[PDB]
Design a protein around this motif. Structure first.
Motif, PDB file in Angstrom:
ATOM      1  N   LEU A 256       0.834  -1.202   0.000  1.00 48.60           N
ATOM      2  CA  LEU A 256       0.000   0.000   0.000  1.00 48.60           C
ATOM      3  C   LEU A 256       0.866   1.249   0.000  1.00 48.60           C
ATOM      4  O   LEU A 256       1.994   1.241   0.487  1.00 48.60           O
ATOM      5  CB  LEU A 256      -0.961  -0.022   1.192  1.00 48.60           C
ATOM      6  N   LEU A 257       0.346   2.308  -0.611  1.00 51.21           N
ATOM      7  CA  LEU A 257       1.068   3.587  -0.706  1.00 51.21           C
ATOM      8  C   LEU A 257       0.164   4.698  -0.189  1.00 51.21           C
ATOM      9  O   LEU A 257      -1.072   4.571  -0.183  1.00 51.21           O
ATOM     10  CB  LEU A 257       1.501   3.882  -2.162  1.00 51.21           C
ATOM     11  N   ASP A 258       0.796   5.790   0.232  1.00 52.58           N
ATOM     12  CA  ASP A 258       0.072   6.989   0.703  1.00 52.58           C
ATOM     13  C   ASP A 258      -0.551   7.793  -0.440  1.00 52.58           C
ATOM     14  O   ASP A 258       0.163   8.345  -1.282  1.00 52.58           O
ATOM     15  CB  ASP A 258       1.020   7.895   1.506  1.00 52.58           C
ATOM     16  N   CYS A 259      -1.875   7.919  -0.397  1.00 49.21           N
ATOM     17  CA  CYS A 259      -2.665   8.515  -1.457  1.00 49.21           C
ATOM     18  C   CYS A 259      -2.549  10.036  -1.608  1.00 49.21           C
ATOM     19  O   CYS A 259      -3.133  10.602  -2.533  1.00 49.21           O
ATOM     20  CB  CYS A 259      -4.138   8.114  -1.267  1.00 49.21           C
ATOM     21  N   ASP A 260      -1.809  10.675  -0.703  1.00 50.46           N
ATOM     22  CA  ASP A 260      -1.489  12.113  -0.778  1.00 50.46           C
ATOM     23  C   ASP A 260      -0.124  12.342  -1.421  1.00 50.46           C
ATOM     24  O   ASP A 260       0.020  13.212  -2.289  1.00 50.46           O
ATOM     25  CB  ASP A 260      -1.448  12.743   0.626  1.00 50.46           C
ATOM     26  N   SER A 264       5.388  12.910  -5.643  1.00 49.61           N
ATOM     27  CA  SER A 264       6.826  12.748  -5.512  1.00 49.61           C
ATOM     28  C   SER A 264       7.336  11.326  -5.896  1.00 49.61           C
ATOM     29  O   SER A 264       8.531  11.132  -5.975  1.00 49.61           O
ATOM     30  CB  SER A 264       7.252  13.078  -4.073  1.00 49.61           C
ATOM     31  N   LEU A 265       6.453  10.357  -6.138  1.00 46.81           N
ATOM     32  CA  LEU A 265       6.898   8.983  -6.464  1.00 46.81           C
ATOM     33  C   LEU A 265       7.679   8.962  -7.757  1.00 46.81           C
ATOM     34  O   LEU A 265       7.236   9.519  -8.745  1.00 46.81           O
ATOM     35  CB  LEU A 265       5.699   8.040  -6.570  1.00 46.81           C
ATOM     36  N   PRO A 266       8.848   8.320  -7.770  1.00 49.87           N
ATOM     37  CA  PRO A 266       9.618   8.308  -8.988  1.00 49.87           C
ATOM     38  C   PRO A 266       9.037   7.360 -10.077  1.00 49.87           C
ATOM     39  O   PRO A 266       8.200   6.515  -9.771  1.00 49.87           O
ATOM     40  CB  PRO A 266      10.983   7.820  -8.527  1.00 49.87           C
ATOM     41  N   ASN A 267       9.476   7.559 -11.328  1.00 50.84           N
ATOM     42  CA  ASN A 267       9.072   6.699 -12.440  1.00 50.84           C
ATOM     43  C   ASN A 267       9.779   5.369 -12.257  1.00 50.84           C
ATOM     44  O   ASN A 267      10.817   5.317 -11.591  1.00 50.84           O
ATOM     45  CB  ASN A 267       9.464   7.324 -13.769  1.00 50.84           C
ATOM     46  N   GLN A 291     -13.168  -2.134   1.638  1.00 51.70           N
ATOM     47  CA  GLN A 291     -13.408  -2.020   3.104  1.00 51.70           C
ATOM     48  C   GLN A 291     -13.905  -0.621   3.558  1.00 51.70           C
ATOM     49  O   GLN A 291     -13.620  -0.200   4.683  1.00 51.70           O
ATOM     50  CB  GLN A 291     -12.195  -2.484   3.941  1.00 51.70           C
ATOM     51  N   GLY A 292     -14.663   0.068   2.693  1.00 52.39           N
ATOM     52  CA  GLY A 292     -15.257   1.382   3.003  1.00 52.39           C
ATOM     53  C   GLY A 292     -14.759   2.522   2.121  1.00 52.39           C
ATOM     54  O   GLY A 292     -15.413   2.878   1.135  1.00 52.39           O
ATOM     55  N   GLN A 293     -13.599   3.081   2.487  1.00 55.88           N
ATOM     56  CA  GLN A 293     -12.986   4.248   1.810  1.00 55.88           C
ATOM     57  C   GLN A 293     -12.124   3.857   0.565  1.00 55.88           C
ATOM     58  O   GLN A 293     -12.574   3.042  -0.248  1.00 55.88           O
ATOM     59  CB  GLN A 293     -12.190   5.077   2.832  1.00 55.88           C
ATOM     60  N   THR A 294     -10.912   4.421   0.418  1.00 59.29           N
ATOM     61  CA  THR A 294     -10.134   4.350  -0.846  1.00 59.29           C
ATOM     62  C   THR A 294      -8.606   4.195  -0.637  1.00 59.29           C
ATOM     63  O   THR A 294      -7.986   4.980   0.093  1.00 59.29           O
ATOM     64  CB  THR A 294     -10.415   5.595  -1.721  1.00 59.29           C
ATOM     65  N   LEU A 295      -8.015   3.206  -1.320  1.00 57.94           N
ATOM     66  CA  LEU A 295      -6.582   2.868  -1.182  1.00 57.94           C
ATOM     67  C   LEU A 295      -5.752   3.012  -2.470  1.00 57.94           C
ATOM     68  O   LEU A 295      -6.284   3.040  -3.583  1.00 57.94           O
ATOM     69  CB  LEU A 295      -6.426   1.437  -0.659  1.00 57.94           C
ATOM     70  N   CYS A 296      -4.439   3.086  -2.279  1.00 63.00           N
ATOM     71  CA  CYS A 296      -3.475   3.222  -3.363  1.00 63.00           C
ATOM     72  C   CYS A 296      -2.505   2.041  -3.384  1.00 63.00           C
ATOM     73  O   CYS A 296      -1.533   1.997  -2.626  1.00 63.00           O
ATOM     74  CB  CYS A 296      -2.710   4.531  -3.220  1.00 63.00           C
ATOM     75  N   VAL A 297      -2.775   1.098  -4.283  1.00 64.43           N
ATOM     76  CA  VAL A 297      -2.035  -0.163  -4.325  1.00 64.43           C
ATOM     77  C   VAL A 297      -0.871   0.010  -5.291  1.00 64.43           C
ATOM     78  O   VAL A 297      -1.040   0.583  -6.379  1.00 64.43           O
ATOM     79  CB  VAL A 297      -2.948  -1.315  -4.796  1.00 64.43           C
TER      80      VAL A 297
END
Length: 337
Positions: A256-260, A264-267, A291-297
């Motif tokens: 999982l990654l931070d959706c904010d 800044s994530l590199p290519n 599971q309710g809200q929203t994630l960044c896989v």
């Protein structure tokens, strides 16, 4: 004549499928076009499991072009297995009519990936060396019947925006420049089974770290697999990459990654035939509502079964239009349009 455009549906950027028919008169199905396997199968009318009753079923007794075979059919994939028997009948893709095509009539299906699937079955597009049970794949029979003229290729376009009306396309016997820009870069197939080839390197260069992430250092092998959602890699290397990206393993296989902090994530860059094919975070981050809200896989993952390939699935094959060429035994990539 051809070419034959096959239109695909996109479900949530994780499965793509499209229509075919079998028999006379036509019986309709939905299938995944899978470059990672080489068998065709569908649910049998002889099957009355929940699974079968929830899907379209093939009834040989209603087809005037059916021919019995009855040899056993058994295949195991990564995410499932199927058992049944072989029959032969006409198989239609757009205006193409493949006479005497063998298929598996499925009686027993395992694996949640198959049981829950929106598709009825799998139409394998891999080389004939990896077909099981002695039956010739669909594209091979198209070639034997001369249905592609003199251009025995197929080209795959996958739309990575699920709200669009056009999910994608398989173009049997052609290449469509309205799905790509620049020019195609080809790489030779190194082993004719999967659509397998040599990769020169894999890297990522973050601004917020002191060292670059350098993987596949002395070169490695990859496959282009339309039958899977993500990019899979050798476990030590794909874990290192996911760590370099700031992911946390949680829990069964996916990071999982931070959706904010996505800006800044590199290519991530694959070098193929000496050319760089770069994935941006917009390409490789998958958005999910589980599971309710929203994630960044992360679209990069490792299997628990040790294995050495980079398996380039839908994450890679959306941003890069792909040409699978049986005349010259080569794969082509070009930036999607």
């Amino acid at each position: 004549e051809g070419p034959y455009p096959e239109p695909l549906v996109n479900l949530l950027d994780v499965v793509y499928y499209g229509p075919i028919s079998i028999g006379t008169p036509p019986q309709d199905f939905q299938v995944i076009f899978d470059t990672g396997s080489a068998n065709l199968w569908l649910p049998s009318s002889k099957c009355t499991t929940k699974y079968c009753l929830h899907h379209h079923r093939y009834d040989s007794s209603k087809s005037s072009t059916y021919e019995a075979d009855g040899r056993n059919f058994t295949i195991v994939y990564g995410s499932g297995n199927v058992e049944g028997f072989i029959s032969k009948d006409v198989c239609r893709i757009g205006s193409a009519k493949v006479s005497g095509q063998p298929l598996g009539e499925a009686l027993v299906v395992g694996g949640e990936s198959l049981l829950e699937a929106p598709f009825d079955g799998i139409l394998g597009l891999a080389y004939p060396s990896i077909a099981v049970d002695g039956v010739v794949p669909v594209f091979d029979n198209m070639m034997k019947q001369g249905l592609l003229g003199e251009q025995n290729v197929f080209s795959v376009y996958l739309n990575r925006d699920p709200s669009s009306k056009e999910g994608g396309e398989v173009l049997f016997g052609g290449i469509d420049h309205d799905h790509y820009k620049g020019s195609i870069t080809y790489v030779p197939v190194t082993a004719k089974g999967y659509w397998q080839f040599h990769v020169d390197g894999v890297k990522s260069v973050s601004a917020s770290k002191s060292a670059p992430e350098l993987l596949c250092k002395d070169g490695c092998e990859a496959i282009a697999n339309t039958g899977t959602s993500l990019i899979t890699g050798p476990p030590e290397e794909v874990d290192s990459l996911n760590q370099y990206l700031g992911g946390t393993k949680t829990e069964g296989g996916q990071y999982l990654l931070d959706c904010d902090k996505l800006e800044s994530l590199p290519n991530v860059t694959f070098t193929i035939s000496g050319k760089e094919f770069s994935l941006r975070s917009k390409d490789y981050v998958l958005k999910v509502n589980q599971q309710g809200q929203t994630l960044c896989v992360s679209g990069f993952m490792g299997l628990e079964m040790p294995q050495p390939l980079w398996i380039l699935g839908d994450v890679f094959l959306g941003p890069y239009y792909t040409i699978f060429d049986r005349d010259q035994d080569r794969v082509g990539f070009a930036e999607v349009a």
